[PDB]
Amino acid sequence: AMKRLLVTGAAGQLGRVMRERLAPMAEILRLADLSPLDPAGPNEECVQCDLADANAVNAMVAGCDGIVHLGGISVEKPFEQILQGNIIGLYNLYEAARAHGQPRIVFASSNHTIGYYPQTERLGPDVPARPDGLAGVSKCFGENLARMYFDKFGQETALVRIGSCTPEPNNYRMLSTWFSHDDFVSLIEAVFRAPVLGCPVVWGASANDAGWWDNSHLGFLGWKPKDNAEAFRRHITETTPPPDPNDALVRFQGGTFVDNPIFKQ
Amino acid sequence: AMKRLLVTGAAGQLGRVMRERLAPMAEILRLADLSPLDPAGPNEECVQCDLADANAVNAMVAGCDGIVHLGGISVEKPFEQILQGNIIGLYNLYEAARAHGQPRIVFASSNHTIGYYPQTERLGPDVPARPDGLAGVSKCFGENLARMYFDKFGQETALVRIGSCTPEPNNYRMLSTWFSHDDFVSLIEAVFRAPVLGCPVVWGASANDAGWWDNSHLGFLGWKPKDNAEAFRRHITETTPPPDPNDALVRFQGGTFVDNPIFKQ
Amino acid sequence: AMKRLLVTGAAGQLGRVMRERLAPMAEILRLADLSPLDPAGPNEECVQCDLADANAVNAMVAGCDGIVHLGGISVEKPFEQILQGNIIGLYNLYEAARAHGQPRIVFASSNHTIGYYPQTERLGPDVPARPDGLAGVSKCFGENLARMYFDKFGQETALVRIGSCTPEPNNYRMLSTWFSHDDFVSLIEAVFRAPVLGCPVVWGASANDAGWWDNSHLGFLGWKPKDNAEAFRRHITETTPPPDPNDALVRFQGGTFVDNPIFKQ
Amino acid sequence: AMKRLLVTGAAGQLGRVMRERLAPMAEILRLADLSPLDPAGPNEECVQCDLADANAVNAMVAGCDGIVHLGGISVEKPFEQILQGNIIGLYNLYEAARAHGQPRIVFASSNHTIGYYPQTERLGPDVPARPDGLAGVSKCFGENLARMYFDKFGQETALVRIGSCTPEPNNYRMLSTWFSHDDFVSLIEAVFRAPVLGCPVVWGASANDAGWWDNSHLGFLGWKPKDNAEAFRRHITETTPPPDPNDALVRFQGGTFVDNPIFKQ
Amino acid sequence: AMKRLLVTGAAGQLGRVMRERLAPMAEILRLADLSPLDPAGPNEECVQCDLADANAVNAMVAGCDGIVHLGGISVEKPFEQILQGNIIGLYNLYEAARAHGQPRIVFASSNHTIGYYPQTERLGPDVPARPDGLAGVSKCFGENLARMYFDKFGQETALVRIGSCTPEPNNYRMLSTWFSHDDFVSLIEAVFRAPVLGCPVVWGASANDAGWWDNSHLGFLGWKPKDNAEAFRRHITETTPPPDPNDALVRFQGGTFVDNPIFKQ
Amino acid sequence: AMKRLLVTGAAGQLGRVMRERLAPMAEILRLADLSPLDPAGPNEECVQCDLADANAVNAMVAGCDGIVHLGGISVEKPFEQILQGNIIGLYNLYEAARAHGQPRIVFASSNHTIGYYPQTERLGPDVPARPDGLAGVSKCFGENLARMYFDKFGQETALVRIGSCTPEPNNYRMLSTWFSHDDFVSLIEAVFRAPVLGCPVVWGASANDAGWWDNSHLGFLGWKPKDNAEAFRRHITETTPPPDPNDALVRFQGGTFVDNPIFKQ
């Protein structure tokens, strides 16, 4: 599919998965993270750098034909860390791409951009943001920045609002939010194969009977997820306590993130 | 279903398909075209006439219980040819129907009525027209005329905006626009069986993963296409050159029609 | 699912089905009706009373963890009868629930709340009511009352606008309105399992190709009907007279109810 | 305008206003109420009857060319009183109208049909009901019944959702809900003069800067209210205590009605 | 505003008004009509020709900086006449403009493009067409053709759906459809002054209290009509017969045009 | 209206205006800026601090009952400066407010959050952001952060998307975007007087005939701007060159900001 694909956040949980699963997409896979990476094998390059370091990010991106941007802060943390990984880091990534041929980007956004919506409300891609903490706010920043680079320079980005990308659903909320490895992989393949992408919002979930999100406007991309969290409903009842109706886990799309305070260093 | 079914445009590529496939729908199939028709076999009648000749169209329609109107200009041509076949011709068809019991009509409209929309935009049946040439404008004329006859006289018409009704998808655009022979035939069967039809806009496409159009409002008809162009994606990448992202073929719903000039005779 | 489930209208056509099919949902099924009930078997309790009598309704509800409310008038009748079963009866039911722990309610509303809409119009859950008679108006009363108790007290109710819940479709309208026993049972299961329900409008139909109604906004519940009336189209055409296009049966969503007069005592 | 106009609820605060202001609209004004009416002057008839008494309502309506229906319960009361005045009473009114030439009806509905909406939400005429008590639910009943008589028999009704029809705004909520006497009178004049009315929902409010409701779809009637509660804002801050932000008065469109319990006799 | 402005249909009722009122907009006014024109005065040119004749239309347009296109058939007539003036004539006009610098066009479309909508329905600019006869269908053709030339060549046109442009309202329908001379003149001024126009639908009515149409989306143009037909209501009631509620005049937006047959030569 | 009102950015152009105009709103006006301020007069406190300095911001906010936040970067600048004033600065302001009683905030957002929309498109408050540079993106950050603090802590903020707040309109774009001093002052008064505000988007423009923005959903606030840029149209024609139709000034809502590159330090 391409000569060189960059995967950032490659030492993280999703990154380790994609390091294996996206190998067939490119002759060379370049893996990057702030954290130490397992050594490069055949057809791999490994890079260590902070997203907040502009010169390092420039070098990280140079020579890459595509980027799967998983690197950054995924859970609620103090502002200082979010600022570095998700705000400054995003600016540096977009500037680096702009300097090196505008390789297409798959951005790991988050359901936390809309975490304060009730689970009873079905959402299209144009709904106003309701971020459930600083992490969500920073993912909104990434989306707004990507949109600006698209309108201004034509840089294309898939804004993937990831639900819960896990080996299997493991609580009641994931019956709605589960995004299987297979379905995220197929989405990434669909994003890179498209002649024209634009800067679309993509709801990152499998084809769950209990899904909250409407991807119908993305029809042009031809991506239909195949897995379905509903198959795990009994598994969940037989492995977890029944949710309290007052629990954020079943009240808000962001789940317990709404209960987070502003964390401090 | 009925004693006699009229198929216009019967010499054309699509009409030749329907001459074969719609036979079971009527005791007699009347085939008509401006061009020479293969001679009538059993249970057939053949009539060669110009849609622009009112007296001929009156006789063509007389004694028919339904009409599949494929006849006319469906590619970009100079104004005079389109005026005769698609504007004068449509007036003549509707007047003929009005004089002979208002047989129900399946009208071959076209995606070219909306050809200037970007391929990234999903369309419902009520979107404003954006025709991509004179052919598209003339198909809009047919839709507007049909609506008027419906409101004024009760004449019922299915306004079928045909995508690409071909044996198989064979380019990137057809992954979205493909309308299988089987699915068009089943649509026609559903149109004629309905006790009440009205004058609905119908998107002429199969159940393609990459489809751009929303047929949900047509639910009352009970027609669900079964074919899916997505099955051909791999085959298409294996047997055709990758599209240029700048090509109208992958930018506009009307494809290369947007690039057509106004043709002169 | 629960210790004790109440099924009202248990002597009726649908009640007799649910008395059998809902047994696995609770340790004890309590059946109630105005009319005589077949004697209680193991795991059953049976009570005979009028919904219009508050003391009786209090006793009927006391000790129940959930209610499937089928009891009442579902065909057009004189106002006097409707007032007792569907208006006074509903007030009594909601007051009894409020006094006894607010057991979740599945309310048998009706398509007759929207019976005057044309069959050609697809409806979402928020459409304004267009009741086709006093029965329809009275089911609207139930919906409005339920919504008030939800907003004021937190009482949760599924407002199920039942189409045609029969063993099989047997006329043209039922190709659209059929609601299979299996699909109603699975809906009831999905309603009671949900940690959070609210007070949603639910369109009571199976997954019919010719369905008129949009349940997409109920996605959070994870209920997907599995039956399809379309399978019966051939049989219906074979075994029944073609509808006249002027017949209410094929013109209004409420079918022949629009033709009902106001019946008098 | 007409020979005889019926005004029900004529003993009430609003009815007393209309007894005076609507006199010019008819040769004879018939006033009716359950409560004692000031004796009839010239060009008046007075009738004292209960809306729940069908025979009385028949005689009340007989010989009338139009009806302004103000009679009934418009504050929260126990169920039985509301049942008699607003449910049985509405049935009786519509049946009486049906038996006597279908005189056009102005129905006093209420903002309480939508009382649970937040004051920050702007509402169009098609929003789903959110009644704030039994009074609101019963006013919804009137709206649903009127719609049914319209669709079934052609009876025309203006469904006027009255905000606060008082001499002057005197609290923060009335800056939004105020409906001047002048503007209600002009609305009634516009309703009766219209060749074609239908069964429209009308928001009963003056042209208030802080209004919550959108009457644009009623444009065809040519009624434009002229009064504006905003003129009273300064006066209100000068003569009343500032509202507590936690008070229902400034949180819900139904104001303090949301705080009402279910009243018992 | 410009050196030379063309006004077609200049011999007609509206043309004679604009010949006078638009004189200040250009150094030279060129007046054109099929029929004889009063002789050119200072600052005028007059040309007599049929829009169906391409050579003549080329000469008519050459050297003009803008066009107010009033010429054509605006009442119901046989298809032959409409074809010449409104279909062939429109094609000729757009081709002439394309060959001569694409002077901006104000097109006299018509309310008859939407004549079958009920008067009770408020319309925005995107509603599907519901033409009330061949004249209406032909004005739709003009709109669709204009839109194609805009998308394909950048030709800008204001599609003005004229209501009733008369010296004063003189029947009930005109209380809604009246478009004063002053307000049409100011619209034309706003159209020509705009740096960017596009191809907008414009509802051609004054600021009537009983208006049916929504021009809010045209806000960017900065045009606000100032006249109001409501001022004439009393006069109209005094001096004309009350409409029968069954009259097309008070039921359909196109008024009596819905009652027109298809006229024959 | 309050004991102490904070105005940030008080040395800037809008700040100097508000220092005078908002004086009557509070017993004490506290003015702050990174830049030196003219010395405090009677009833004034003057503070010098960087918004990026958390401790200083805490002290700035402490003791204030309301905040008009004008401080920050208003034009396109390099990322480093934007990061400090609009990103870090916003976090510090919200944290400081949260620590000191959550004084209500008027936030100076910007039209640049939606700068890439065409001027021909009318925008409601819920449209997706289309920021026209880093400044717009950073104003989006402020909006998203404010929304999160509202949902999480109940902090109330008016998100005022300022158009062009100048003494008078001085170019063609300002005929649409002008926000008079008087109208901004009255908006601020309305925001502080409201019992309940929430976190609404407010379009910051006067009542311009050529306005692009719809504030109708803010109706509850009772704020209606009184000035109208249209009065200056002739003034603009007689003081500036006519805009080129290709100029960003008349093509994009953000005007020439779309033409800005990413500026560097």
Curated annotation (Swiss-Prot), chains A, B, C, D, E, F:
Pathway(s): Carbohydrate acid metabolism; D-galacturonate degradation via prokaryotic oxidative pathway
Name of the top EC class for this enzyme: oxidoreductase
GO MF: nucleotide binding; uronate dehydrogenase activity
pH dependence per the UniProt record: Optimum pH is 8.
Annotated InterPro entries: Epimerase_deHydtase (IPR001509), NAD(P)-bd_dom_sf (IPR036291)
Annotated SUPFAM superfamilies: NAD(P)-binding Rossmann-fold domains (SSF51735)
Induction trigger: By D-galacturonate.
Keywords for this protein: NAD, Nucleotide-binding, Oxidoreductase
Catalytic activity from the UniProt record: beta-D-galacturonate + NAD(+) = D-galactaro-1,5-lactone + NADH + H(+); beta-D-glucuronate + NAD(+) = D-glucaro-1,5-lactone + NADH + H(+)
Entry annotation: catalytic residues: 135
Comment on activity versus temperature: Activity increases with increasing temperatures between 4 and 42 degrees Celsius. Activity remains near 80% of the maximum after exposure at 37 degrees Celsius for 30 minutes.
Amino acids binding NAD(+): 13-14, 33-35, 50-51, 70-74, 139, 165
Sites where the protein binds substrate: 74, 110-112, 164, 173
E.C. no: 1.1.1.203
Pfam families, per database record: Epimerase
Family label: Belongs to the NAD(P)-dependent epimerase/dehydratase family.
Additional record remark: D-galactaro-1,4-lactone was previously believed to be the product of the reaction of D-galacturonate oxidation.
Assembly and binders: Homohexamer.
Entry function: Catalyzes the oxidation of D-galacturonate and D-glucuronate to galactarate and D-glucarate, respectively. In fact, in water solution the substrate D-galacturonate is predominantly in pyranosic form whose beta anomer is converted by the enzyme to D-galactaro-1,5-lactone; in solution, this reaction product rearranges to the more stable D-galactaro-1,4-lactone. Makes part of the oxidative degradation pathway of D-galacturonate, which allows A.tumefaciens to utilize D-galacturonate as a sole carbon source. Cannot use NADP(+) instead of NAD(+) as cosubstrate.
Protein name, entry field: Uronate dehydrogenase
